[PDB]
């Protein structure tokens, strides 16, 4: 039995609104969330992060186009169900408002957790830790190249935590950082339904081994960290989701990102004089092998008149297919066990046309390739500068965080004051709860210290990280 009232949850974690609410006040709850998200520092920082080129689109302008495509898929789904007189049977009679708002806010904050420089900024964090923790040596019985005495295998009940911590710390993902940023750092206090829309994958970060064949697609990438294990269980209990299951509305957000994947970069390439509009049209004609979508736009223009109709032509052919795919496989999506994506036909083959042209003529440009190598060097250097913070002992770091005026560590104390206050507050709150008289305190303390170090690096704009790296090396 499909019932969307058991999925759309308007409760919160702190100061949750209790009691019965009417249809009007329920809508007011989902508008304050919109006000919170739009006026948040995390969204403002998106305009200083680059998509491909450093009139070019940024991540803020890119996420605004994904938000428009999501609205349109939700509206098509809602209108198609009313024709079949299934809106009342599915529980969506008094929930058409929040249904689109949740999708729109999930599409907006789908890239808030990406580190500076993007993909190559994500790899640099992973390799640097991989050399200090050596996760591959903790898979089996004690062998050990670990550089930390407390995390070296030596004690069956304590080795499982050691290997979990060692595996988790070498798996940094932007989607997993998005949940942590929205709950622990920013403290936005969003509704349960809103948080579930940004849970793209369900594989834990500390997972080592083979995933079940029933969920081999939903667990292809890490979804959340170990420090959020208690928060994810409460979310699953609140939204009635089984283990390793997905929220129904996440599928619409995934399809919106796939539509707006390369089309914007092709337009941005023309504005940088990589090629001309006629050259791009010839390249598309050669790669295709189009008439209804591309040819209609070509004869209707010349630069700001070719893409403006191509986007409409491809939307009018892709959105109904996505709506029909969502509607057809409804029980599996509602259960959360659908192991496929909405988008092997003429529709999916069309996206590969834009995919192949972009990787060959835009992503291979020398200027794009150079920035990828420079970004990898910047992140590696920043982690080496803060390495003395990770080499201290528990007592020394406790004295540093408590006294703030230490006469024994002049270099280490000055590096400590450069960290943002929110990250330090999060660290203090996290370590202010573990049992002090336990044989697990050093391990958790080291894990939280590493997480605190990782939060500071990933919360920077590309431009700020470069400036800080150049200044800390006595170059600028």
């Amino acid at each position: 039995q499909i019932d969307f009232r058991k999925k759309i949850n308007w409760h919160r974690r702190y100061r949750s609104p209790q009691g019965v609410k009417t249809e009007h006040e329920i809508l007011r709850i989902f508008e304050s969330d919109r006000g919170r998200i739009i006026n948040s520092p995390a969204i403002r920082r998106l305009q200083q992060k680059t998509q491909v080129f450093p009139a070019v689109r940024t991540r803020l302008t890119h996420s605004m186009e994904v938000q428009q495509v999501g609205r349109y898929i939700a509206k098509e789904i809602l209108s198609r169900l009313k024709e079949l007189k299934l809106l009342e049977a599915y529980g969506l009679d008094e929930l058409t408002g929040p249904f689109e708002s949740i999708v729109e806010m999930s599409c907006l904050m789908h890239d808030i957790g990406n580190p500076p420089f993007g993909h190559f900024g994500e790899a640099a964090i992973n390799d640097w830790f991989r050399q200090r923790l050596h996760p591959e040596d903790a898979e089996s019985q004690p062998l050990d190249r670990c550089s930390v005495a407390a995390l070296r295998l030596r004690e069956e009940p304590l080795n499982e935590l050691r290997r979990k911590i060692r595996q988790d710390l070498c798996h940094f993902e932007g989607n997993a950082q998005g949940i942590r940023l929205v709950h622990t750092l920013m403290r936005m206090n969003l509704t349960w339904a809103q948080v579930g829309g940004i849970l793209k994958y369900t594989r834990p970060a500390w997972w080592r081994g083979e995933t079940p064949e029933t969920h081999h697609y939903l667990m292809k990438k890490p979804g959340y960290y170990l420090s959020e294990e208690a928060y994810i269980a409460r979310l699953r209990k609140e939204l009635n989701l089984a283990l390793y299951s997905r929220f129904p509305l996440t599928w619409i957000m995934e399809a919106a990102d796939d539509i707006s994947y390369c089309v914007a970069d092709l337009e941005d390439a023309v504005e940088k004089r990589i090629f001309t509009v006629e050259q791009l049209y010839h390249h598309l004609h050669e790669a295709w092998g189009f008439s209804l979508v591309v040819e209609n736009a070509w004869e209707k223009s010349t630069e700001d008149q070719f893409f403006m109709y191509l986007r409409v032509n491809t939307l009018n052919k892709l959105v109904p297919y996505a709506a029909q795919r969502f509607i057809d496989n409804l029980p599996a999506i509602f259960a959360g066990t659908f192991n496929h994506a909405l988008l092997a036909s003429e529709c999916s083959d069309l996206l590969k046309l834009y995919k192949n042209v972009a990787v060959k003529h835009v992503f291979s440009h020398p200027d794009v390739e150079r920035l990828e190598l420079q970004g990898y060097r910047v992140i590696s250097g920043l982690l080496e500068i803060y390495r003395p913070l990770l080499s201290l002992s528990l007592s020394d770091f406790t004295e540093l965080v408590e006294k703030e005026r230490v006469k024994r560590f002049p270099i280490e104390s000055r590096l400590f004051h450069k960290l943002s206050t929110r990250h330090r507050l999060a660290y203090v709150e996290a370590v202010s709860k573990l049992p002090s008289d336990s044989p697990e305190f050093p391990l958790w303390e080291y894990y939280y210290r590493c997480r605190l170090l990782q939060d500071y690096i990933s919360g920077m704009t590309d431009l700020y990280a470069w400036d800080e790296y150049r200044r800390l090396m006595a170059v600028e």
């Binding site: 993909h119 994500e122 790899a123 992973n126 991989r130 591959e136 070498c170 798996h171 993902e173 083979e210 995933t211 081999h216 697609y217 292809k220 990438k221 890490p222 994947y261 092997a344 999916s348 083959d349």
Partner: protein
């Protein structure tokens, strides 16, 4: 869309783990004609060049394909260290 760093790291770790038993792995990758999915072929053989076994995996997603390759390599290592 692009391959995740952790999957590549795990694939390399499995390759080195099986290389620690004086073995070798050849890698081939291509795109099929009409199945609309990428194909990767692996061959396991010793240093002298005696082929042991081969496998081919087809999938349209990079992450799943690499995970399947990694777990097949791990199973090969497990079976080859059960005896010999």
């Amino acid at each position: 869309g692009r391959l995740y760093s952790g999957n590549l790291a795990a694939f390399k770790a499995a390759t080195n783990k099986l290389f620690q038993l004086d073995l070798a792995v050849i890698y081939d990758d291509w795109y099929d004609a009409y199945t609309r999915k990428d194909c990767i072929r692996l061959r396991i053989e010793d240093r002298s060049g005696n082929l042991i076994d081969t496998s081919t995996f087809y999938h349209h997603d990079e992450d799943v394909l690499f995970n399947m390759c990694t777990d097949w390599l791990n199973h090969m290592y497990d079976q080859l260290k059960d005896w010999k």
